[PDB]
Subunit: 256 residues, 4 copies
């Protein structure tokens, strides 16, 4: 009952963290806009989650919107107002992570990662915030960043600046949207077992080395992020804006 009758837009919600965060939002009474990339795989996943959300009495719609396309922000807002009447929460989750070495990093891979992880998020946040301010009823914006926003990654010279930039956008947006009662925060997931980690997880030796680094003793699951996202979108966090929240099982603080 934390988001009853609220409209929640979750970009990249056909798989992994976004999918489980869109489910728990409908379980908290929200009508969810299930944004996806527009591919035929993301359409299969977004419509699969919709079947599951309606299965427990929820209500949700699938919207195709490539994050790299800067028009996608207004496309999601329009389809959310038209189906449910408002936009109350934006969970910005869409992003890529193509691991690659720095010195031979192709230019087009860098811009593709920046355009998708940061550029599209900016104007997706702007279009959602514009609707929130017009309504005058406040709102919440949560950006799924990463632990990599505080530390480095050798194969991620193109990826971590977009996660660190995503965190810094919530800080400056909190000051700008504060006078309109719009809260902007970021969750920093640690090591979550998801579709990006398929090849690395099957190796048992690497997985034990990854698990050994986490004080809680296990890798993360998409459901582990759903709670803190519903929390940051709720009245329980009514005085929380411009903040970050690690969800990593203690990974960041466990210096070897």
């Amino acid at each position: 009952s934390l988001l009853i009758d609220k409209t929640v837009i979750v970009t990249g919600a056909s798989r992994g963290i976004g999918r489980a965060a869109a489910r728990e939002c409908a379980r908290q009474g929200a009508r969810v806009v299930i944004g996806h990339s527009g591919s035929d795989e993301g359409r299969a996943g977004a419509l699969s989650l919709a079947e599951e959300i309606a299965a427990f009495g929820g209500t949700a719609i699938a919207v195709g919107a490539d994050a790299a396309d800067l028009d996608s922000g207004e496309k999601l807002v329009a389809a959310a107002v038209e189906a449910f009447g408002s936009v109350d929460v934006l969970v910005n989750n869409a992003g890529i992570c193509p691991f690659h070495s720095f010195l031979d990093m192709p230019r087009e891979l860098y811009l593709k990662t920046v355009g998708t992880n940061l550029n599209g998020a900016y104007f997706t946040v702007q279009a959602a915030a514009r609707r929130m301010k017009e309504q005058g009823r406040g709102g919440a914006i949560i950006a799924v960043s990463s632990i990599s926003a505080l530390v480095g990654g050798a194969m991620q010279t193109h990826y971590t600046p977009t996660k660190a930039g995503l965190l810094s956008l919530m800080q400056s947006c909190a000051i700008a949207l504060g006078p309109y009662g719009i809260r902007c925060n970021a969750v920093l997931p640690g090591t979550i077992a998801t579709d990006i980690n398929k090849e690395d997880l099957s190796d048992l030796e690497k997985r034990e080395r990854m698990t050994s680094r986490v004080p809680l003793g296990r890798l993360g699951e998409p459901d582990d992020l759903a709670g803190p996202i519903v929390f940051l979108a709720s009245d329980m966090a009514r005085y929380v804006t411009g903040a970050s929240l690690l969800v990593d099982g203690g990974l960041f603080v466990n210096l070897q």
Copy 2:
């Protein structure tokens, strides 16, 4: 619904932030141990809260336990097991903030500040963690630090190291207690409630209002619940945007 059949110990729960957290924890279904300094004001406030919690169907006791006395942790843990038979959550909230200039800080005031704010919290955490481990069912530990754990204060040279010290403790203990399923986190409140000075402080909060003690209940109950089962070693600002608002 979030804390059914859990035993929560809140130190300094007679006034301010700890009082509002203890009340909310009781609403969530928890058996709460209300801790106070043992003074007349602390004992009176602990009673009044136990009266209100009992009136709406809660379960709570009131235990006096000076945070500076390093024995209080085991005293509150013994009082908790004796009444409810478990210890599952600890909210270390007790603390003082006596403003004072730096170049003339007397040893007495500093040692009382570090002794109340940090030294007592350490062994209060130690006591609660000892019971959680031997129980074998996990548990949560939340320390009420401050936004002053990330920045400084000229009249708080003796105070901000204890806040940042409390944050560091939650980082280390989360390592040493992760295998026993004991999560440790720190909440960082901002400015929680001269009218010309009151609005000048409000001018710097992007949300446009000072905090209230109930603004810390939600964040504390979230960290102590299954909503945060993968959240340990983290800090959470609860300040209305005060930290990011640079000018």
Copy 3:
């Protein structure tokens, strides 16, 4: 002295922080590639600094390289090698901060800021790291970020993520370029009195109010960054990589 027999590239060295840093490295015995954007004003300033560096026996050349142009980084390294034989230090300083509100941010303004401050830096850092690894004698890279990498600004929703992304790029590049003896760090200046913020300093009430928030009791000057920048590029910082350093007179910690 500290930078003898060393070639330092300093982008955006015609004015402000870059001009002071390039002059100081030359005072420490280095041969400085003075980078500018190519404008007539920039070229005049780069030439003015070179003539000053020659006045006290130093050696420097002026090279135009539009940071918004992603081909400029390879042209900067080539000009340095051709004239001096090596690239040993890179001070990435070129950047802009066009103040603008968030909700009506034009697409051109955001993309111009991100492309200049972050995207151009990435490939200027790549081209310089490529030469340093090739030479086999290590190097140093210093990105001029900002205190805005740790906090926000309501009129800088597009600008602070490029500063936070520069810091994080240095963290990730420290790991990737560590085995080759290349140290990567970032300086976070506070409010330095330059042309990037001159309109706010044109007001006496605004200038004195900003000074009130600095514990050291004065706004920064460009030379206040030259010392810290030369320290990080020298053997003094032998064991310093992936770190940040505030040069703000205490502005960050002074909670209001």
Copy 4:
């Protein structure tokens, strides 16, 4: 030379980082006051460094000053002005790190840890800062903290809050001493080596080598010099990239 005519006090300056920093300041023209713990070996090391400093033309004195004894701050200051007529820089390096598990952490072990690392540093800083204000010619203060001021350590639950608090102490003192031209900053060294496990620890450092005391003398002399005239309330990691290299 960057520290000519300046008087520098270095606590814990008989071994490790403090010894390397005290010698490096002497090579920069400073009159060094080599503080030590008063132990048998401590006085030997501090007196051997003063002859080594005098061997290359420097000027240094040795002063026994137990950091846990809060009287030490004014003892070093008075000994510095008696010997050199001034106090211009304070390098607070003295500290202990006794690794110990948390759930059976003795009370007296915690109290010695915090007392030496934080409380004793507090009043050493205060004693030096009052003399710097009395001279009215500015000053600089450097606190040797650690990477553990930002992360956790399961066997260092008593240790990391002391180092996180020393950072928080420089932040707040920066504000309180800014108006007097006193800069306060902290260095955060990584694994400073002062063989099966030594190989694995090196594999986590991007620079590919562990730390040595001299690796910290450059950062310290920089923060103490005019090259950092606008640097106060800052912290500098000197860890060869250990903090940023996750995994």
